[PDB]
Design a protein around this nucleic acid. Sequence first.
RNA 1: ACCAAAGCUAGCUCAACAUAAAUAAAAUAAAACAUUCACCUAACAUUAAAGUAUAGGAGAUAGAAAUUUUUAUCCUGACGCUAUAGAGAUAGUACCGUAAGGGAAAGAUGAAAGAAUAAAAUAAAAGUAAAAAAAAGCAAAGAUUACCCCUUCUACCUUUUGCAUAAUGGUUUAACCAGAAAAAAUCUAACAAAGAGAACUUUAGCUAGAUACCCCGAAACCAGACGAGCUACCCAUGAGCAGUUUAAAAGAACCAACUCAUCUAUGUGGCAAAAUAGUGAGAAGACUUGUAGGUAGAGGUGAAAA
RNA 2: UCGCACACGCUUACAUCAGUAACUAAUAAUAUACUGAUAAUUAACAACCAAUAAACCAAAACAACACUAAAACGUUUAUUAA
Lengths: 43, 87, 68, 76
Amino acid sequence: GNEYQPSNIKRKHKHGWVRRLRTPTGVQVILRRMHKGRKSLSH
Amino acid sequence: XXXXXXXXXXXXXXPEDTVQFRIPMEMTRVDLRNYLERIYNVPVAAVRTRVQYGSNRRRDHRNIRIKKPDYKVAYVQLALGQXXXXX
Amino acid sequence: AAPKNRRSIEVNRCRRRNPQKLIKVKNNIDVCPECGHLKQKHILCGYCXXXXXXXXXXXXXXXXXXXX
Amino acid sequence: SWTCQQLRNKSNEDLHKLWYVLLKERNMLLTLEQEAKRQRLPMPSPERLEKVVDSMDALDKVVQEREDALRLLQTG
RNA sequence: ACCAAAGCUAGCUCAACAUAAAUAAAAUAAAACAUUCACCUAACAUUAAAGUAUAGGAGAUAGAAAUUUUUAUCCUGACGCUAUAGAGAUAGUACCGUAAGGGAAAGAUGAAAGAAUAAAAUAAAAGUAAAAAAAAGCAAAGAUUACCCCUUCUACCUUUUGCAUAAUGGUUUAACCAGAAAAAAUCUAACAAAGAGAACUUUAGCUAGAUACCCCGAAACCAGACGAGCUACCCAUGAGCAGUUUAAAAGAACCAACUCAUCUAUGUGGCAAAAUAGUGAGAAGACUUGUAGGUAGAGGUGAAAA
RNA sequence: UCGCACACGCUUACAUCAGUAACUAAUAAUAUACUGAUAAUUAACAACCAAUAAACCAAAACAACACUAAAACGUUUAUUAA
Ligand SMILES: [Zn+2]
C-alpha cells in the first residue's frame, strides 16, 4: 500500500508553528529555516 | 468600493425582491443591512450571505502557482413592492 | 536478450529499404462515369454518391418523422 | 493642487457629505465596470473610471491626512 | 540544410578602508592499540629568543618563558573569473520528504520591427545518394583503375611472468577532469674574511633567485536533533461481526461480510517496488475497526523470528 | 453488473461560452478529468457557549429475570448570572 495516511489535525498539531514555539529546539528549527530563507516554516 | 452589484451574472432567477451583491468577507449581514438602509435609502427584509473561495492559476514564466483573491457574495430581500431588473 | 553491438548505417539502410520494397505503387485511379471525378477502381464515387446518400438519409429521417 | 484646495477649505460635515457621495458613485460606476468586464464586452468608459479611482484615492488621502492632522493636534 | 554550434550582458570572489539547569566529542595519527595527538569553543599583533629550555608507551610527537625588537595619518582595486568559470541564486523558487532537511534548471534580431539586411553554415545523428560479375578482410597500406576484388598485418587501454585474447574499462560526440611543499644540495648572480635593510651564519663563506613528493571511493565511529499519519504494544473514546440445525444456553458445528494469505497457476522493467484467478483459515473471540494520545537509536517495542 | 448518501480529508478539478496547428487525456472520436474567458446557493444542516454546590443505588444482552467480565452515554434540588 503506502506509509502515508493524510491527516490535517495531526499535521497542524504536531508540525505546527505553536509546537515549534513550545520547544527551544523547535525555535532553533524555525531559526535555521529563517536562516536558510524558507518561504514556509510549515508545510 | 467594498461592495458591488451583480444581476445578469447569476443564472438563478429571482426577479422579485431579491438582489445579488459582492461584499467584503469581514462584513456581517447586519452591518450590510444597516448600510444599505441608510446610504441608499431602501428597506431590507432579509440578508443571506455565503463565501466564495477564489480559483487558482499558475504562472509559467516564474513557474509559480498563484491563487485569485477570495470573494464573498450576498443575497438581499427587500420590502414588498420592489422589482430588481438589471443588465 | 540484449544487442551485442551498435548497428552500422549500411546494415540499417539495407534492412529498412530493399526487402520491404517501401510502398508498392499500383494504379487505383479511374474516372467516374458520372461526374468525371477521379476516384478509386472497383469502388463507388465519393462525389455524386455521398451527397445523394446524405440527401437520402435526410429524406428518410424526414419521412420517419412525418410518419410518426 | 486639488488636495491642497480641499485642505484650505475647512468643513467637518461637508467633507463626508462629499466623499461619501463620490464613493457611492464609484460603487455603481465600478459596478457597471465589473458587469461590463464579466459580460465579455469591452470597457465603455475606462477613462472616467480611472479618473474616478484616482480622485477617490485622492479624497480618501485628504480625509486621512486631515484626520491625522486633527489627531496630532489633539495629542500635542 | 536538418537537429545545430557562433555572436553580448546581468552577476559576483578577495584585499583595503569606512561603519528548570549541567567540563562537547569521536573517527583519526602513533601503519594494531591503551598513555599521547598541532589543531578546533572564547580570549590569543611585528623582529628575534626558538623549534631553544623541557615534556613524551623518553615512542609518535608536544613545546614555552625570562628577555628582545617594533612602527603617524592622508594615497582603493585587480599579471580574479564568466553561463560547464565565479556564490547554489533571473530563487532558497519549482520540486522531493510526515518532518527536520535536501535542492534545481532556466536570457542573445536590429540604432530603431521599421520584423527578409547580417556574416559560417563544418560538432556526434538520418535526408541529396543502398548493397553493385559465383569475394575475402581489427577496417588499411603497396599496386591498380577517376571506383573494387588479389597480395602484406592477432583492437585500444588497464592489470600482468605472459592478453587479439573467451581478463579489465569504454554507444558515439562535445565539454569538464586528477604532481600545487627548498632544509641540505646542484646552478645563476651580489660582496668577500665577510655576507645580509640592527636578525643569523661564517677555517671561503654569506645573501638572493631558479630546480623535486596528483585525484575519486568505502563498510563504519561520534555528536546534536528529526521520526509510532507505516508498523509493534498500550491508554482514552465509539462502532462492526447475515443465515441454518438445536436440549435453557452471545452455548457447539457449518457458512456470507470483515479480518488473514494454505496450495497451485499467472504476472517477472508488471495492473502492482507484495498483484490477480481458483482454493483455503478464523469468522462471539486471545475478534475486527474509526478517532483522540503515549513509548526511539549508550533505545523503545516484541503470545521471542535477531 | 454494484453501487447512491455522511465524513476525515482534496484546494476550482467543476458549470457555461469560445477556441483545439501545438501541448494536454500513450491516438482518433472527443472530453467528467486541455487552453482561454465567464458562472459557483439556502436553512429550521453541520461546527461555536452557562459557573458551582448537594441527592441516589440494584450493568448492558427489544430482561419481571438470570449470568458473568462486576457494568458507553444518565437525572434531580438549590444559589449566582447572561
Ligand atoms: Zn462521381
